[PDB]
Design a protein around this ligand. Structure first.
Ligand SMILES: [Mg+2]
Ligand SMILES: [Mg+2]
Ligand SMILES: [Mg+2]
Ligand SMILES: [Mg+2]
Ligand SMILES: [Mg+2]
Ligand SMILES: [Mg+2]
Ligand SMILES: [Mg+2]
Ligand SMILES: [Mg+2]
Lengths: 338, 63, 51, 132, 220
RNA sequence: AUAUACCGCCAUCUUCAGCAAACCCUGAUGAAGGCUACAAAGUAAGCGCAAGUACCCACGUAAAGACGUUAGGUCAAGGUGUAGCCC
């Protein structure tokens, strides 16, 4: 019967069942366009109506109602099938997504530069990296086990400016937008020795996460936890070692790493603080000292005590490595370039 | 943009660092005035803390 | 691997511009194979060519 | 909860026209009827015939102008003249619009034995009354 | 135009005191205004110990010696900002002096916010006022404590937004985040009047000097 | 056959005023939280309520009543996915 016919929108609504009791709590098909591959005035009988589906005027005169031959209509049908197949293939193809720390993990995936600011500010120089994605839930009075996405993103320009932000949203893309927009307003500046590494060894314990970062020479690479590698790439650090101990909660690690890197003291700051030259001894350069930093104010005449035995607390792991007793099979493995 | 990390460094330090990094395209109106006439104490944040042991406020009685 | 995926990259001792990309500029040590992903055959060819 | 001809709220992403936005209980309050004829008045006959004709006219115009209809038709009857006032989109070419108008006029006239005038009002895009 | 703007802006920065604000106040004037009276020893905040001259019968005495230098620096900075035509916003939740501060701001051609400070008025300004709104270039706290004696949230908001803050810090106030803290009494009408008069005079001097310098150069 | 795939029309709290995208802030940047008017971080477009409308007032009765809960009902209004019979 004709009078029971409905519209494509209502039919797809009924078919796909996009809404329903199941979808509320997650207790397969997708929409298709059945009007794209049609030209108004084309039917199975292959009639050619002047002015609608064939040009109205031919030889400067109105064309007549025509009909394609049987074989010509079959040719048109084959062409339509071919166009349908081409569209189907263009839908079948998939994006060759670059994978992060693992094929199905968001960590390390790049979200691109943060959106331009309301005042026209542009952060095209910046890059955003996802460090974590949690599907946090929370029981509600009526909605029950609500689902939300907690995202952590680090934004950096590879020139010492880098920050991180948490993102809460029901939609993953919304969380990405929120986090990568909120991070740019929370940028730190990380001082880099020679623009490739930290200025000194950093030992810290943020909450229950211990971070031990060792300054390293040029070309040593990033031998660090993967999140630390991502954050170092964002900052602009190329050579550094880093060991994480205790709880390795990603947010705790990120916050502690940024705190330590921000709190590091530059060579110039040390020179000003102690009123003395800062001298660097490079083995490749022999005994030739290199004055890396010198004080701005009056250089002290006091030679500073030459302590016979320091009282600094030593890391047992570092002492063990220096003595060579550490037999860890996993230590100093050959790994891809970082 | 700026750096809303008010607990990290001072406003001057953050602004100077971002300007050096190029994040801030132009210095703020107050930057040069501050640099010329910095305050006696850098406005670095500092969490207050109660004195627990034998430590006491070094405030003398005016007699 | 990088060398085998571009036939035009011929590993010869005169292709110093290509060989310099598999030697650490700061220390002059040939990267071990896992560093660059080069297969063992091409890594041995690269080592011989660099030497 | 009531569901009759109501566009349920969303995150401010779906545009809707006046007709779609306004709910059934607003008929004759903020929105008029889409069809005007004497069938439904007191002591008037052939309301069923008029309703069937209107339903077929809508299902015919929608299919004859696929996607070209911006908003529902407006059917008016005067004596025997039937006026179909439609709001369409400025996408299809004027030649094709005129061909379809003439075809529809002739076919509907010969099918319902009454003169039919099809008036078209073209707009760049679906008129947006509010975002729901 | 570069040379013009340079000689207009950078030139005052070459002088130790380009506006002669030192003439606006003296330690005796502050003492008469009672700038030196603080709260009880119990109400003392830990970070005001360096600025407290001592305690007299469990009442703290703010060292006007330090207050003089701090106020000199703060007034010089305020004058420089006003000369450079930045936006100066006075802030005080003291309902006693709300009207006086509003009148002073309206007279000096600067802005005042003595009312309930709605959240996000600085951090969320681009939404609460329009994306193109311009934020204050300097914030002057005539009272750094809100009406529950906690620090005025505008202090933290200005620190977040990188807006320099001049501020009168009493003995129970927290001066860590105030860019230019002026340790002094903030609860007495005489002290509040002295502060308002000094800031109004500095702003008016800076603006009139700016106009005079602009005219002087453009005449050339 | 499947209302435990749905549209469509509805029961239900509802004789409720809450739901709120987008921002900002607090929690050391954890799940989460954001209330004090002599105000102490909330601002919120939109929806709902409200307002407006019908009946005889401006009253009252209608109507309306968001988001969600009960995989609440309806494959037997009709259509439709899936599966199934096709002498
Ligand atoms: Mg995989
Ligand atoms: Mg006080
Ligand atoms: Mg059901
Ligand atoms: Mg009911
Ligand atoms: Mg009712
Ligand atoms: Mg109502
Ligand atoms: Mg059921
Ligand atoms: Mg049942």
């Amino acid at each position: 019967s004709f009078f029971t016919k409905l519209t494509a929108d209502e039919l797809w609504k009924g078919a796909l069942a996009e809404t329903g009791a199941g979808a509320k709590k997650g207790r397969k098909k997708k929409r298709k366009d059945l009007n794209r591959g049609q030209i108004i005035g084309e039917g199975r009988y292959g009639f050619l109506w002047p002015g609608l589906n064939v040009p109205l005027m031919k030889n400067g005169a109105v064309q007549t109602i025509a009909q394609r031959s049987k074989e010509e209509q079959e040719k048109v049908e084959a062409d339509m099938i071919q166009q349908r197949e081409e569209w189907d293939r263009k839908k079948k193809m998939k994006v060759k997504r670059e994978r992060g720390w693992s094929g199905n993990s968001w960590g390390g995936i790049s979200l691109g530069p943060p959106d331009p600011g309301p005042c026209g500010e542009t952060y095209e120089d910046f890059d955003t990296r996802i460090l974590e994605v949690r599907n946090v839930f929370t029981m509600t009075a009526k909605e029950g086990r609500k689902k939300s996405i907690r995202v952590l993103v680090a934004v950096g320009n590879g020139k010492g400016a880098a920050g991180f932000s948490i993102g809460k949203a029901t939609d993953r893309m919304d969380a990405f937008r929120k986090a990568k927009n909120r991070a740019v307003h929370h940028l730190h500046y990380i001082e880099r020795y020679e623009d490739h590494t930290i200025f000194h060894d950093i030992s810290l314990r943020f909450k229950r996460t211990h971070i031990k970062m060792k300054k390293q020479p040029k070309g040593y690479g990033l031998r660090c936890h993967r999140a630390i590698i991502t954050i170092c790439r964002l900052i602009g650090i190329k050579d550094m070692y880093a060991k994480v101990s205790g709880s390795i909660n990603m947010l705790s690690l990120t916050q502690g790493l940024f705190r330590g890197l921000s709190r590091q003291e530059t060579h110039q700051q040390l020179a000003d603080k102690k009123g003395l030259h800062v001298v660097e001894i490079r083995e490749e350069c022999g005994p030739l000292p290199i004055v890396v930093a010198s004080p701005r104010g009056p250089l002290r005449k006091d030679p500073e005590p030459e302590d016979e035995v320091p009282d600094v607390k030593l890391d047992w792991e570092d002492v063990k490595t220096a003595q060579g007793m550490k037999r860890s099979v996993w230590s100093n493995l050959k790994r891809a370039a970082t | 943009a700026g750096s809303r990390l008010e607990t990290v460094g001072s406003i001057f330090s953050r602004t100077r660092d971002l300007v050096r990094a190029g994040v801030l395209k132009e210095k703020p109106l107050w930057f040069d005035v501050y640099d010329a006439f910095p305050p006696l104490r850098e406005p670095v944040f500092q969490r207050p803390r109660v004195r627990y042991g034998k430590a006491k406020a070094p405030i003398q009685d005016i007699w | 691997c990088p060398i085998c995926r571009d036939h035009k990259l011929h590993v010869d001792f005169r292709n110093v511009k290509l060989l310099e990309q598999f030697v650490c500029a700061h220390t002059g040590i040939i990267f071990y194979a896992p560093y660059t992903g080069v297969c063992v055959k091409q890594h041995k060819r690269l080592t011989q060519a660099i030497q | 909860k009531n569901r009759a001809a109501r566009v349920r709220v969303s995150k401010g992403d779906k545009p809707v026209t006046y007709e779609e936005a306004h709910a059934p209980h607003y008929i004759a309050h903020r929105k008029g009827w889409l069809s005007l004829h004497t069938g439904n008045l007191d002591g008037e006959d052939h309301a069923a015939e008029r309703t069937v004709e209107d339903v077929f006219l809508r299902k015919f115009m929608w299919g004859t102008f696929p996607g070209c209809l911006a908003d529902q038709l407006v059917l008016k009857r005067r004596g025997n003249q039937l006026e179909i006032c439609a709001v369409v989109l400025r996408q299809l070419s004027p030649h094709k619009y005129y061909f379809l108008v003439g075809y529809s006029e002739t076919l509907l006239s010969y099918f319902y034995k009454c003169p039919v005038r099809l008036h078209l009002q073209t707009v760049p895009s679906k008129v947006v009354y509010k975002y729901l | 135009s570069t040379d013009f703007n340079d000689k207009i802006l950078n030139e005052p920065l070459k002088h130790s005191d380009f506006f002669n604000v030192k003439e606006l106040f003296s330690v005796r004037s502050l003492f008469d205004a009672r700038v030196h009276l603080g709260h009880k020893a119990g109400c003392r905040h830990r970070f005001m110990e360096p600025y407290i001259f001592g305690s007299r019968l469990d009442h703290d005495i703010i060292d006007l010696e330090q207050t003089a230098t701090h106020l000199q620096l703060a007034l010089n900075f305020t004058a420089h900002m006003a000369y450079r035509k930045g936006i100066i916003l006075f802030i005080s939740r003291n309902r006693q002096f709300s009207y006086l501060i509003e009148n002073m701001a309206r007279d000096c051609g600067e802005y005042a916010h003595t009312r309930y400070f709605r959240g996000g008025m600085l951090t969320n300004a681009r939404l609460l006022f329009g994306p193109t709104v311009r934020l204050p270039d300097l914030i002057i706290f005539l009272h750094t404590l809100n009406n529950i004696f906690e620090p005025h949230v505008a202090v933290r908001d200005a620190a977040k937004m990188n807006i320099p803050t001049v501020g009168i810090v009493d003995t129970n106030c927290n001066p860590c985040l105030i860019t230019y803290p002026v340790p002094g009494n903030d609860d007495s009408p005489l002290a509040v009047h002295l502060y308002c008069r000094l800031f109004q005079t500095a702003i008016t001097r800076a603006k009139e000097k700016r106009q005079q310098v602009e005219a002087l150069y453009r005449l050339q």
